[PDB]
Amino acid sequence: PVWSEPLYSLRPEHARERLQDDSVETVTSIEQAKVEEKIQEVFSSYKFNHLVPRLVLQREKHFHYLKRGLRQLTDAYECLDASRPWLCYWILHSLELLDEPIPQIVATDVCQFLELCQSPDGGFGGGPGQYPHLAPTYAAVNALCIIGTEEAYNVINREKLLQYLYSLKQPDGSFLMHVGGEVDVRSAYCAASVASLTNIITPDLFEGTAEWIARCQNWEGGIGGVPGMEAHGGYTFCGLAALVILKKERSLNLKSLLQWVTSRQMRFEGGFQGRCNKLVDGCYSFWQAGLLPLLHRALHAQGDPALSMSHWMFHQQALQEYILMCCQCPAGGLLDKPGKSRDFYHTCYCLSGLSIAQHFGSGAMLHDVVMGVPENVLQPTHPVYNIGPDKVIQATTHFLQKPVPGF
Amino acid sequence: FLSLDSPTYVLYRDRAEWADIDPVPQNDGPSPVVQIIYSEKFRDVYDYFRAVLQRDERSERAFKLTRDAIELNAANYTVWHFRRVLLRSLQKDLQEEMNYIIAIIEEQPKNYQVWHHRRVLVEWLKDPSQELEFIADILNQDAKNYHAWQHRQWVIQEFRLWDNELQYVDQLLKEDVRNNSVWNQRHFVISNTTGYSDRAVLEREVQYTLEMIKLVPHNESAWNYLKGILQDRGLSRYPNLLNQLLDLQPSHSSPYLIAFLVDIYEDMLENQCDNKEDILNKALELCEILAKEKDTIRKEYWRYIGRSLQSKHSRESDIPASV
Numbered sequence: 001p002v003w004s005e006p007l008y009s010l011r012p013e014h015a016r017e018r019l020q021d022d023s024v025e026t027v028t029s030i031e032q033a034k035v036e037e038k039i040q041e042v043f044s045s046y047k048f049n050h051l052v053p054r055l056v057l058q059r060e061k062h063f064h065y066l067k068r069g070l071r072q073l074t075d076a077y078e079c080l081d082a083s084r085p086w087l088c089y090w091i092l093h094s095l096e097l098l099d100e101p102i103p104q105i106v107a108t109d110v111c112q113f114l115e116l117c118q119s120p121d122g123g124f125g126g127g128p129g130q131y132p133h134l135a136p137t138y139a140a141v142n143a144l145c146i147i148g149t150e151e152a153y154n155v156i157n158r159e160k161l162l163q164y165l166y167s168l169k170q171p172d173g174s175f176l177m178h179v180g181g182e183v184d185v186r187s188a189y190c191a192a193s194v195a196s197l198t199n200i201i202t203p204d205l206f207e208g209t210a211e212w213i214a215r216c217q218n219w220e221g222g223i224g225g226v227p228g229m230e231a232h233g234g235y236t237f238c239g240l241a242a243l244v245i246l247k248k249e250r251s252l253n254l255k256s257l258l259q260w261v262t263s264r265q266m267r268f269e270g271g272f273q274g275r276c277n278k279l280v281d282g283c284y285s286f287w288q289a290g291l292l293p294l295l296h297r298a299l300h301a302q303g304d305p306a307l308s309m310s311h312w313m314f315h316q317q318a319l320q321e322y323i324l325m326c327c328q329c330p331a332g333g334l335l336d337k338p339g340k341s342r343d344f345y346h347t348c349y350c351l352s353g354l355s356i357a358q359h360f361g362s363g364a365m366l367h368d369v370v371m372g373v374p375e376n377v378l379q380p381t382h383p384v385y386n387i388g389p390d391k392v393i394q395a396t397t398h399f400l401q402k403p404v405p406g407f
Numbered sequence: 408f409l410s411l412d413s414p415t416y417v418l419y420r421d422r423a424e425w426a427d428i429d430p431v432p433q434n435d436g437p438s439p440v441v442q443i444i445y446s447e448k449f450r451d452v453y454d455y456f457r458a459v460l461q462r463d464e465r466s467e468r469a470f471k472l473t474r475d476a477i478e479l480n481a482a483n484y485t486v487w488h489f490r491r492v493l494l495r496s497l498q499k500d501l502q503e504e505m506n507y508i509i510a511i512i513e514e515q516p517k518n519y520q521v522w523h524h525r526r527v528l529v530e531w532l533k534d535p536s537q538e539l540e541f542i543a544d545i546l547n548q549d550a551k552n553y554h555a556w557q558h559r560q561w562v563i564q565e566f567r568l569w570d571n572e573l574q575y576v577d578q579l580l581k582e583d584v585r586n587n588s589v590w591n592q593r594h595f596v597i598s599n600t601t602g603y604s605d606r607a608v609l610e611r612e613v614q615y616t617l618e619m620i621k622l623v624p625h626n627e628s629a630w631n632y633l634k635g636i637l638q639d640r641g642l643s644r645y646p647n648l649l650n651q652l653l654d655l656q657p658s659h660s661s662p663y664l665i666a667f668l669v670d671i672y673e674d675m676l677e678n679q680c681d682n683k684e685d686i687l688n689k690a691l692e693l694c695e696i697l698a699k700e701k702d703t704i705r706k707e708y709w710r711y712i713g714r715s716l717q718s719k720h721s722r723e724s725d726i727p728a729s730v
């Protein structure tokens with residue numbers, strides 16, 4: 001119909017999705033209202049300017065932002081001086097999704113830089129001369145696999161990495177983030193991620209890990225940083241993804257989890273919140289929404305016959321609308337929410353989420369949903385590692401031809 | 408003893424007491440990637456940090472240097488590790504260090520490293536006497552600080568300081584009944600104290616929740632808490648629940664109450680209830696009402712539940728193909 005609105009967020013019924021504070025005001029409702037009000041302005045802008053809406057992913061603009069940052073950053077990133085491998089990964093992955101080639105001049109410089117970050121004793125640090133840490137180690141391995149050239153693969157010292165992983169392993173199945181450091185679900189995932197890709201997973205490395213992760217699932221259905229903590233999207237993704245790698249998804253109450261994540265998508269904004277009663281955030285377009293592909297795979301593994309065959313269990317269209325209309329910086333790069341400044345973290349995850357929301361894949365079945373102009377379609381991303389599905393296969397296929405340190 | 412923000416602050420290369428040290432510039436290689444264009448102050452401090460770290464110089468001046476390196480980037484875990492080495496080697500007064508970390512956390516509360524550092528201190532000192540109050544102050548500025556609640560749970564568990572937490576929880580829920588972190592803390596205190604098997608306790612909790620739900624019908628936290636404390640024993644295990652929720656649809660309705668209804672029906676069908684088919688259809692109509700009207704953002708979920716429930720509870724679900 002001519003009166004019909006193709007964009008879900010601009011339909012008149014949508015207004016009914018605004019917050020109902022039951023005339024009881026608290027800091028949470030006041031805060032949620034401010035955001036909704038700001039998002040409504042964005043949605044309504046087309047009607048007020050008398051323009052027909054067009055959802056365009058600003059490719060060239062994001063490419064410039066990425067291209068440059070990959071080589072140089074302002075002092076605004078001094079706070080990430082101990083996370084340089086993360087910067088490499090987020091940027092290289094954003095380019096990968098945007099489908100931009102990685103010049104060999106760059107691939108080699110990247111490889112060399114990560115070598116400088118690698119520790120004599122295994123794992124990578126957040127920068128040259130810094131002690132190793134599982135987070136920058138997970139990023140380094142990922143960045144190298146994205147490059148995926150023989151040179152990149154050879155940067156990784158597999159015997160040392162394994163030694164390192166063991167030196168962090170705890171009696172209760174968990175892992176320290178680094179020597180003398182803290183423990184949380186993130187370490188489980190970082191370890192599982194790098195150990196599986198490089199094929200250094202011994203019979204006892206992750207003993208008890210699946211059980212420890214399972215202990216992090218709480219009364220909410222979601223997973224918390226450590227046993228007993230509020231359910232959070234970032235940690236939940238970490239827990240499920242790790243279990244998927246360990247083939248222990250069933251250790252969790254997948255049902256209560258599925259219900260928890262599906263409730264994390266905002267009815268009005270369209271994007272996801274990190275935890276119940278907080279604000280929407282573009283990066284959760286990945287941590288939260290990225291869970292559905294994981295769940296679909298687990299439930300399907302269990303023969304679940306109700307699973308859709310063309311969509312994930314979240315409003316794909318509404319998420320693309322949030323990202324596209326509310327998360328792009330006109331100057332390039334993406335962000336948390338309208339009003340927030342751009343950064344590479346959000347560029348990486350807003351795009352990863354967009355890709356996931358555009359591509360449905362369950363074996364033979366393949367259905368896409370691309371909001372806005374077709375040029376908006378991105379390269380698909382693997383829901384466990386968050387690098388090209390191709391890079392995952394290629395990487396593992398290369399290291400599987402190597403003996404697991406020790407044999 | 409010269410703050411990183413003092414107007415008379417001087418770069419380290421211009422300090423007499425540091426003339427003997429050659430700064431160690433950062434080894435970024437021939438052609439850098441993700442190279443950060445540091446400010447003069449930042450690069451100066453870290454060039455000297457790199458030197459002390461390299462020589463593993465355990466000195467009072469190195470100790471003071473780490474404070475500046477930390478303030479420039481509190482996320483540099485390598486510097487925090489060296490600082491802890493110096494705290495022990497130099498036998499530094501840990502209460503003074505406690506004074507320091509509470510100041511840093513007040514300043515940058517959403518950093519992983521500062522909280523981990525405080526935890527290490529509390530452990531070393533084996534003294535949690537200041538923890539609940541300090542955290543309460545942080546929480547008073549951000550009632551949802553994830554690291555704050557995590558530290559609070561650790562301290563309470565490791566030192567068994569359960570006695571007043573429920574009271575604290577009641578205070579914050581009053582301030583903001585929508586604070587999901589507090590509902591989580593509530594479930595935390597009860598689970599580790601009385602537990603929810605004590606019928607008097609469980610009863611109390613559900614009463615409280617329903618009470619809250621009445622006051623703020625659309626606050627999802629109360630609803631999730633209610634489902635959380637009853638879902639393990641089984642929703643169908645509580646026959647009066649359904650009727651009491653139905654007596655809310657009139658006025659106190661929400662897509663939340665409807666979703667709960669489906670949950671109850673689902674569990675009922677899962678325990679061969681009376682009028683199996685009648686219950687099923689009641690659930691399928693609610694699923695559709697939610698997927699197409701009350702909770703459309705979750706249309707895919709609801710349609711899934713719709714299929715699931717029919718896939719295994721239709722009268723023909725356990726009937727042979729040939730029949």
Ligand SMILES: N#Cc1ccc2c(c1)CN(S(=O)(=O)c1cccs1)[C@H](Cc1ccccc1)CN2Cc1c[nH]cn1
Nearest residue numbers: 079080083086135281283336343344345346482518519
């Ligand atoms: N660019 C960039 C950037 C921006 C924020 C940020 C992170 C990176 C990664 N880290 S963090 O601890 O290093 C930071 C927190 C605050 C500033 S950087 C934080 C924790 C993290 C670290 C590494 C991988 C994933 C998450 C996440 N954040 C804070 C945030 C994101 N969304 C809402 N809050």
Ligand SMILES: CC(C)=CCC/C(C)=C/CC/C(C)=C/COP(=O)(O)OP(=O)(O)O
Nearest residue numbers: 135186232234235238274275278279281553
């Ligand atoms: C692979 C890997 C290392 C993943 C990490 C996942 C992740 C995003 C963790 C962060 C969780 C957290 C402590 C948020 C607090 O900030 P906040 O209070 O601003 O968050 P919120 O309001 O969005 O919940």
Ligand SMILES: [Zn+2]
Nearest residue numbers: 281282283336
């Ligand atoms: Zn974010």
